[PDB]
Amino acid sequence: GSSGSSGQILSEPIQAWEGDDIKTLGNVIFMSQVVMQHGACEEKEERYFLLFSSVLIMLSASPRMSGFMYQGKIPIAGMVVNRLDEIEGSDCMFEITGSTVERIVVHCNNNQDFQEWMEQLNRLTKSGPSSG
């Protein structure tokens, strides 16, 4: 083993999920409850992000507790991660774009987890580790 995680995720299929399989994509690098809504609009938006290293799977828990709901998937390809350096001295965090005109603004966290997401997303979106 390694770490624990809520049930269902490993018992029932992901709601909305429809294509082939999730176990076919790979695994779940880093999974945690993030908050992605937009660039200041109304409020925040809690959601689950599953980094497979080949795509960013997103889940939702509209209800209370009962499995998850697959919203969309972001292929590492075309992805754009630069800890939102398009600004200047204004919160670290990072975004997850790579499409027509979509930008995923994930809320900070302040923990080894964050740095991780940035660490992987770094090599993910890219090809190989930064100066190994």
Can you give the residue ranges of every domain in the chain?
1-132
Gap between the Cα atoms of 89 and 67, Å rounded: 39
Under CATH, which number does the domain 1-132 receive? 2.30.29.30
Gap between the Cα atoms of 119 and 102, Å rounded: 22
Phi/psi for 113 (5° steps) reads: -65, -55
Cβ atoms 51, 28 nearer than 8 A: yes
Task: Decide: residue 25, CB within 10 A, 0-12 exposed, 13-18 middle, 19+ buried.
Answer: middle
Closest CA to 107 of 16, 43, 21, 30: 43
